[model samples]
Target chain A: MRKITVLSFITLDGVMQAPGGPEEDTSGGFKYGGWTAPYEDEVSGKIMEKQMKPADYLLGRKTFEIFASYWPEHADFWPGINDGTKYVMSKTVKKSDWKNSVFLESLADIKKLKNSEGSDIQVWGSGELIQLLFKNDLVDELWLKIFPVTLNTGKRLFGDGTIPAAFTLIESSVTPSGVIIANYKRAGEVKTGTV
Target chain B: MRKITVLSFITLDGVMQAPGGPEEDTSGGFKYGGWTAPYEDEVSGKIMEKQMKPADYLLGRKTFEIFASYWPEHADFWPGINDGTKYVMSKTVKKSDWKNSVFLESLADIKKLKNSEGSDIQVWGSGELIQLLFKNDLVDELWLKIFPVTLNTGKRLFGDGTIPAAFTLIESSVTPSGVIIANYKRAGEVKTGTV
Candidate 1:
């Protein structure tokens, strides 16, 4: 069975809004758009390269648009994305000019897609879509690049819609600039006990 | 130069509520209390003991009440707390029969307390008061025990009141039970750059 992995750059406070540039995402009056820029280092760059390994891309409409507009020009950095398939989950988006791209409408479609034979699906920078995945209990792995700063007011990674679950840290490392690259696999239900 | 450190047992999703027992905090209908029980080990125990190295305790009224009621009975586990002074921040609570306890009514009172000669104050399980401290730019350090589970519903460590700031991870270690113990000191302002 193909796994569904969630990839993101989050802050200490769990905010994942607009990591790339100041103009990347301005929804909800988000002023700190390029909050993740300063923490870039060789360690994080290599870690990101490792994370961007060939996989089927799953994205929200906003993130899909962002990648479609950006990655095509900067193919030197992320060339594999051009050849790989992209599954964009959105309600209003109908078609895409981007090659090898498909649209998914419902959670059932995603569940079926996951069950179908293919490489692991990696969801990137799709905060809203990730919330739905968490609520539905579809996420199989979490690969997070945790920055050392806080936005304090922005779209968060874990919203109220998230359901109770447990994850085990499979891999983790720290960069010189203070970014934490953590990988976690879905373990099981929330386990409780008395101390 | 007394620092105000925020100490908490947070989940991957940043929840810090009711980690000890189900009846610990049910204010927001939080169900998964005592979530940190199963992950207990020698590593986390030693780390917690080191974190509890004698300091003046600053707590929200609710947490103060909880600790006052609970820790008094578990003196064997935390013998130093009996001798420590507790500063409880609340508007309603007038006084306490708890030994060496003081009631603070306003943020101004807290500010005055921080300036006055005292040991470094550690705020433990005081979610509401921690938010106020963050908003007022009073927090000096963050010592978080990051658990592997998510409650998805509970009071969070970093609420919307948290101000945008940078923190540098001075130390970090993973426990045998997969808990990430991270210590971060307040770095200056939010630095920005182009990645």
Candidate 2:
């Protein structure tokens, strides 16, 4: 069975709205968009390169639309492997003109995708899809690039009604620019203790 | 009246252990000391300078011992104004050889100190004292320098039974190296929301 993983960037105040650019997300009149620009350095680039080199990618419909419109035009800039295996989880996207792409429509499709014979599947920029996978307990691992900025108000990666769960740290590293790349595997249920 | 504020350097795992150097704190077999080194740059230095400048300093016994020992010996290196403030807080030590220093004994002493009239009383590196002040609802503001690292275990800034409270952001800035400096004022009572 294939292990599903999620990779995301988040701010300090639990805001995971937009780390790419100001235009990426501005829901609820968030003023502090594009807060992650100042923190990127060569060390961060190297880590990102390592994380993205793996084959098989999963994305939500909105994220897929964003990438489909951009990556196709800029395929030459992306590494060969990354441009090759991109999967979009969308009920609306009827087909994909890009190479090595597939559309997943339902929960049965997600289950089949999880059980399919393949390399590890990585999700990027699929915030809503990530919440769903987290709710259904489908995600096996998580890679979080936590940034230092805290937007007082914005969309959050893990929000209301989300079930609590425990995670075991598999690996962790920090970049020169203060970006933390943490890898965690879903463990048992969530546990609480006092300091 | 003086308003007491607690400043903290914390990890994502809610660890408030030392972030400065390996020699600073080694409680609980924490091997990942000096994790904050990777995130410091010229911009971080500037932000720290700004934060420390406007302070009527307060320190817990342990933290007071650390700072008093270091700052007096290194006063020549720091700006003259930083060395001139009246630094007050609780200490078992009967006397301080350093100039402009005062010691208090109890929570009543802190309340007396607050009503006496001075600049805002700021707490730095006083983990244990902060817990007491937080429990008493004496902290008026908080300046948190939340690092990106997650030490799976260490000392925490807030302990159990610490009074819950809300905070309103006054100022926030992210450095080029991704160090965040956030200033917050105490809001109303803290409320727990369903997750």
Candidate 3:
């Protein structure tokens, strides 16, 4: 089956709300936009480059819109984001404005996409879609870049309604600026007991 | 000044809620206690043995009460907990109930405690106290054993009200059960920017 790979920039508190710019996400009065700005270095770019090598890119509506608005003009900044068949998951979006973009109606659509033959399938900065995928047991791999800072308030990656689960850390590296790049594969249920 | 070291078992999502047992902490309806139990191995023991070597313990009222109830009786299990001088942070507690215990009233009291001549002051299972210490800039280092589970619910270590700061990952090791034991020293403020 084709994998649903997640690429996210998260805070130490598991917040993935807004890492790009001040206007990226203002939902819930999140004022700490562009929080990940200062931590970026050569190491971060390399990790994102490798993780974005997939053929298809899956994204939630907000992130999809955000990328669509930026990547069209700034492809030179990040070719990895610029070159991909975009799958925008949204109920409200009537049509796609971004080039090479398609709408993902439901998880059935994602499952069908997953079962079909494909290269790497990816998603980034889609908290709501990521939450839905996690609840429905659809996420296969996670390439998370956890930054050093934590905004006291923002939309968290695993906020309310996230089902308990486990993952295996296949790889990990720390950038000089203290950003943690870790790769994880979805393991089974959470194992527990007393020591 | 005595160094304040935070020693706690945290989840990958930065959860340090309830790792000991189910009944230990049911607040906020947290059901996933003993989450780190299944990951116990020789490496975890050695890490704990080293982390527990401090001459004194500075705990929140709740953690102090919890440890006083258990360690005072189960001294054979962890002699370190049984031997340390206990400092409980509280405003209501008139006096100490446990042996070698002192009551601290506020951050000012902690400041006084820290400025005094003493051995390394360590803390465990004191999430609230740890929060206060972080906010007050009293924590010198952290010894965290991150378990592999994501409960998706329950309390977190660096949750709301935690001052945004950076840490230097000085040492880290992964246990056989995939538990990551990491030690971090306080770095300057969180650095941020683009690639």
Residue A4 displacement in candidate 2 (angstroms)? 1.0
Q: Residue by residue across B29-109, what tens digits does model 3's lDDT show?
A: 888887878887787788777666637889999998888877888777677766777889888885755677889888788
Q: TM-score rank, highest first?
A: 1, 3, 2
How many pairs collide in each candidate, listed in order? 0, 0, 5
List of chain A TM-scores, every candidate:
0.96, 0.89, 0.92
TM-score of each: 0.96, 0.55, 0.90
Q: Which stretches of candidate 3 lie over 4 Å from their true place?
A: A73-80, B73-79, B91-97
Residue pairs with backbone atoms closer than 3 Å in model 3 (clashes): A37-B192, A37-B193, A38-B192, A38-B193, A39-B192
Which 10-residue span in candidate 1 chain A carries the lowest summed lDDT? Answer: A74-83
Candidate 1, residue A161: the lDDT equals 59
- In the range B1-195, model 1's lDDT, one tens digit per residue, is 679999889999899888987778888788898898888988778888878887898899999998888787887888767778999998899788778899999989999999999888989998998989999989999988888887778888888678889999988888778888788999998876556
Docking class of 2: incorrect
**What DockQ would you assign to candidate 2?**
0.05
Task: Give the interface RMSD of each candidate.
Answer: 1.3, 13.1, 2.2
Best by TM-score: 1
Off by over 4 Å in 2: A80-82, A192-195, B1-195
Candidates by lDDT, descending order: 1, 3, 2
Docking class for candidate 3? medium
